Amino acid sequence: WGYLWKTRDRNLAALTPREELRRNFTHLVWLVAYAWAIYWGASYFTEQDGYIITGFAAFIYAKTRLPFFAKGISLPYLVLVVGVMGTLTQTFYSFAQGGLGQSLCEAVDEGL
Amino acid sequence: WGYLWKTRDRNLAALTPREELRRNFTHLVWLVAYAWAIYWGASYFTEQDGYIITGFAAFIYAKTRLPFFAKGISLPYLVLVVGVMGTLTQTFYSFAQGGLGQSLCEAVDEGL
Amino acid sequence: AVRSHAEAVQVSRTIDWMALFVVFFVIVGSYHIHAMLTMGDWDFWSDWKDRRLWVTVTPIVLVTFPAAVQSYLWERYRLPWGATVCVLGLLLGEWINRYFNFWGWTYFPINFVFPASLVPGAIILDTVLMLSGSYLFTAIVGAMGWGLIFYPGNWPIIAPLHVPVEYNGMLMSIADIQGYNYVRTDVAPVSAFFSAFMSILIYFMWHFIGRWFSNERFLQ
Amino acid sequence: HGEKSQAAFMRMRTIHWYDLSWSKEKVKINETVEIKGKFHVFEGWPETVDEPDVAFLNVGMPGPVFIRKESYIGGQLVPRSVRLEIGKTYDFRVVLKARRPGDWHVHTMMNVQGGGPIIGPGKWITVEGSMSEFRNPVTTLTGQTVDLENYNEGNTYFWHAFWFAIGVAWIGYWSRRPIFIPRLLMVDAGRADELVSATDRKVAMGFLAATILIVVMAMSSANSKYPITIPLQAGTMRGMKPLELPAPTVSVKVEDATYRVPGRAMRMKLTITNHGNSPIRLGEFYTASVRFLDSDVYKDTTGYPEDLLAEDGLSVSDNSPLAPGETRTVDVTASDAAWEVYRLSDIIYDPDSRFAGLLFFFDATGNRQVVQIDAPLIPSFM
Amino acid sequence: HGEKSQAAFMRMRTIHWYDLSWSKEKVKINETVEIKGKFHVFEGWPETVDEPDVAFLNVGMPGPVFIRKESYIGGQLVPRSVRLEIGKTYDFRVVLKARRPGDWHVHTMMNVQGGGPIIGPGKWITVEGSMSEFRNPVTTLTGQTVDLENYNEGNTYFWHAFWFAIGVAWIGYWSRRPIFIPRLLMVDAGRADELVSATDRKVAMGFLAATILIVVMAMSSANSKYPITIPLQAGTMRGMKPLELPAPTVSVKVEDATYRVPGRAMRMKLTITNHGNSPIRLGEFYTASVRFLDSDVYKDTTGYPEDLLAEDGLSVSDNSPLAPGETRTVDVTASDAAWEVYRLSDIIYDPDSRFAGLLFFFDATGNRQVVQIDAPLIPSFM
Ligand SMILES: [Cu+]
Ligand SMILES: [Cu+]
Ligand SMILES: [Cu+]
Ligand SMILES: [Cu+]
Ligand SMILES: [Cu+]
Ligand SMILES: [Cu+]
Ligand SMILES: [Cu+]
Ligand SMILES: [Cu+]
Ligand SMILES: [Cu+]
Ligand SMILES: [Cu+]
């Protein structure tokens, strides 16, 4: 969290859409890892009895490296990390900023 | 419900106020029958142990034959039929569309 | 964000394989904790799969996470498999737990520690929500068909374990001798109708719970 | 395993397991071992354990490494819960059949509904063989011999794999199209009602048709293949027969009982009165699975667990024979490493520092009196 | 009515009603019928029925077609709940007075607080007359004879009709004006505060004055007309006297009990030991209101209900006299249509397939032993 937090992008107001899409993909890889750790920590080892790191690091990466999440603390994405559908809706809307949503909205007549 | 539902008035946007008042009176007779069936089904025969048809048909008749109810599904009038004060407030405001509410608001100085 | 135009559907399909991973393995591990904490044991042993308590409390307690994932996905993406992915995740996550922890280390036999069957009720919920696009018709018809098909859908597995045996002078079933040997530390339609009636209320509450969890809001 | 973390006063004051036997200590696969004995339900039952009105005679083992063939309280088979009475002695027998090879620590225990497990003494029993040779045959009232190790296993596998395949086909019919965000963009920006075709509604009503149809035809086929079914048989059996015992001709009063903190011994002052017709000597003190014996009076020949057997752990200050009518006040020390190993010294952390136990008196012939003693236990630091 | 839908194992294993008498089977209005008998509370009481610590001796009838004059458990009047003990036999007597003409099916039952009703055998009793002749006089401690059929009836009618008329006058003062939607339109479009006059507030404070005034003057008049009143008398009476019985000189052990599915008979293997001083024979098996009798040993002369009386329903394979000290293992069949009519064959749907009952042994003189038997009941299909 130290190596992630202090390395926030300062001029986040003027970012390239391609490098923002690279960071969106990196944040989605972070969320995939958090989902895998949610599965492993809960669905296996509570029933052998029968991700705080990964989630707060993903929250830091979305808050720092990514626009659309720098609008303040996200409420479903806070509940997800201190407690995911609202998280994925916000992540998808973060993906739909550069071109993918005025470019993908022209592929709906050629590629569904 | 088949004979009521498919017989919806198509041009409900241009109705005569007199025929709309006739349909308002018919819907109120439907609601009177639903009240009588609510009384008979509940206040007598649960205590002998000590209206779904009529209510959904009245909901269909209000949704189809009547303006002021074609604004979508009415929430108190849905709770009344799948569960009446909000229903009667909406029914009274349905009555107060043609003249009765700019004509009845001039009878308040002659007939209270 | 992308240069080409056929690249744009190449990119999003990739997202289609990483979000389907983020949905699934979060609604596995949270549905599994809910199912274990709220039931208790209650599904680990075949001699606990009776006609009164099991048939009541299993489809009532387990309609919660389908009711809240379905309201998200159908409103938001028109994706009608909100209940099916929840029951398939719960079934996979507990079949792994029965095969690798119950039979794998404790050596309980797998015909004794199998889990319940949940897929027909979720397909009922999903097909009723997709065909009739309202949640009230789903919360009545599909949520009573969720709780009315549980014991008819589990009876092809449960029925051979109910065969009567005269065991040492007493009358047992095969599931009773299974629970006795393997050492650990008109009731059915009425229970099915009570579970079907309560599943309506639990679906109605958890629909709005998953609506509140479907919010996209920001803070200070 | 599991008994050393229980409270020491709860172990001393719930169930006293004595007269225990094990028919074998080394056994093969598909061979039986019998555990007989008596257990006494203590009269001063603790208020933090619920009363044994719903109790189950269980076996402690690390999973089914033996299968329980039979259990008897009295001489009556007890496959359900029982109601035991406080103050009564019962006679139990458990027949086990060996399933997994290894060396296993087998306990006799009692599961009480609002008090958890009461674990008795455990013996290491060695199972030799291979688990592949284990058979569990049973014969049903419909005239069919099945093997419970593999019965209804392929049927369970079939009916779970079938419905998992149907659910995967339902998800995969909808996951061959772009799943996320042409559809998120299509719902809010207008056209949410062209994301579902008429062919999609045909496939959904096909799924809804041949899910209910498959369920009702499968239920009909199960009812036709298994016409005779009974419910699951449950219910607490009250009417257990207690072991009817003669009243003891020895009366013991505990003046004071102390123990050093720290140490491995407890001490007692006892006033013993022989109301019998023969001279007695004290030969054993049993407190919580641990047997402290006097070597001059009593030797163990039932093969008791050696970690729980103090074969010279009872030191009586005057253990001459006690004549009939004679009274004697005497100092009795119970000293063994099992005081510290089994954490009976952890009664210093208990909110009730009282002990209970059994004393065993032996005549010159060999007739045995079982006296039940109970007193406050006072620690000693200085 | 109502007993055939209860569980058969619950009927067999809660209360055993025997020695039952009915003083009349045809009675007139204002005439009494007495029902005496004994009931035994079974030792293996089911866990799904709550224990009879709060029980009420009731009569099953379709409404008050008789009135209960008296009830006695032991010889002590029991108008409240009682505490019965498990294992005890009690002696009851119920005195009823005929109220409605017809032909009524009268049961003796026990209402247990957490277990509902336990219904005994019912007799058809015919009441002849007219209900107009029924009198129910009682004499109060204030020196007044009232008739409880019509006492306080006009007073109740007056005080409900009065307040209904006052409420109708309150609604009808406001329903002589246009009720709905001059007022709905008047509230939201401004003038909501001219819908209520000052005369309306005068009438409302008149109603609020002479409602409280009428209530307190009516309470004062009731306190002056009835100066002596007591609370309602309630409370569970513990201290019922059990019937003290001699121990039976016959011991019966049930080896196995079976019944065919489907069929109308159950079977038993019994080891019978005569510890008496006279030769016994088995004459009756009572299981759940049904009496299976052996005609050579016992004939019924108390007028038992014929739908529940198998007068030749007991088939003992060797029913010669059993000498004192002699033991005999014997096969006993209990066969009647009442097995299928009263749905005792519906123990196949029960989660506890065990039966209980009473056997009756008769000496050459006629001395009767009542032995209580209890065993698992195993169905037979093949
Ligand atoms: Cu589970
Ligand atoms: Cu599990
Ligand atoms: Cu004891
Ligand atoms: Cu003695
Ligand atoms: Cu002696
Ligand atoms: Cu001994
Ligand atoms: Cu009895
Ligand atoms: Cu006798
Ligand atoms: Cu006799
Ligand atoms: Cu008799």
PDB file of C-alpha atoms in Angstrom, chain D residues 54 80 83 141-143 228-238, chain E residues 43-45 47 51 86 348-354 378-379 381-382:
ATOM      1  CA  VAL D  54     -31.330 -35.615  25.181  1.00  0.00           C
ATOM      2  CA  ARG D  80     -31.353 -42.457  18.541  1.00  0.00           C
ATOM      3  CA  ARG D  83     -32.863 -39.646  28.191  1.00  0.00           C
ATOM      4  CA  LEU D 141     -37.042 -55.092   3.970  1.00  0.00           C
ATOM      5  CA  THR D 142     -37.666 -55.121   0.204  1.00  0.00           C
ATOM      6  CA  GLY D 143     -35.346 -58.124  -0.030  1.00  0.00           C
ATOM      7  CA  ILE D 228     -41.598 -48.760  -0.533  1.00  0.00           C
ATOM      8  CA  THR D 229     -40.085 -45.820   1.342  1.00  0.00           C
ATOM      9  CA  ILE D 230     -40.330 -44.795   4.989  1.00  0.00           C
ATOM     10  CA  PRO D 231     -39.526 -41.466   6.677  1.00  0.00           C
ATOM     11  CA  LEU D 232     -36.312 -40.893   8.559  1.00  0.00           C
ATOM     12  CA  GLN D 233     -36.666 -42.498  11.980  1.00  0.00           C
ATOM     13  CA  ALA D 234     -35.933 -40.084  14.822  1.00  0.00           C
ATOM     14  CA  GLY D 235     -37.064 -39.490  18.383  1.00  0.00           C
ATOM     15  CA  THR D 236     -35.556 -39.454  21.864  1.00  0.00           C
ATOM     16  CA  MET D 237     -35.927 -42.831  23.577  1.00  0.00           C
ATOM     17  CA  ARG D 238     -36.807 -42.377  27.223  1.00  0.00           C
TER      18      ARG D 238
ATOM     19  CA  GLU E  43     -43.422 -43.855  30.545  1.00  0.00           C
ATOM     20  CA  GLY E  44     -41.958 -43.422  27.070  1.00  0.00           C
ATOM     21  CA  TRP E  45     -43.648 -40.095  26.418  1.00  0.00           C
ATOM     22  CA  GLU E  47     -40.435 -35.824  22.570  1.00  0.00           C
ATOM     23  CA  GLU E  51     -44.801 -33.303  29.014  1.00  0.00           C
ATOM     24  CA  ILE E  86     -45.245 -39.709  33.650  1.00  0.00           C
ATOM     25  CA  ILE E 348     -45.877 -46.498   8.160  1.00  0.00           C
ATOM     26  CA  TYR E 349     -45.857 -42.695   7.676  1.00  0.00           C
ATOM     27  CA  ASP E 350     -44.536 -41.967  11.169  1.00  0.00           C
ATOM     28  CA  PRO E 351     -40.927 -41.005  11.990  1.00  0.00           C
ATOM     29  CA  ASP E 352     -41.015 -43.351  15.021  1.00  0.00           C
ATOM     30  CA  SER E 353     -42.258 -46.876  14.271  1.00  0.00           C
ATOM     31  CA  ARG E 354     -42.723 -48.100  17.829  1.00  0.00           C
ATOM     32  CA  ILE E 378     -41.529 -53.431  11.947  1.00  0.00           C
ATOM     33  CA  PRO E 379     -43.552 -53.388   8.698  1.00  0.00           C
ATOM     34  CA  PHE E 381     -44.135 -55.962   2.643  1.00  0.00           C
ATOM     35  CA  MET E 382     -42.800 -59.127   0.999  1.00  0.00           C
TER      36      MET E 382
END
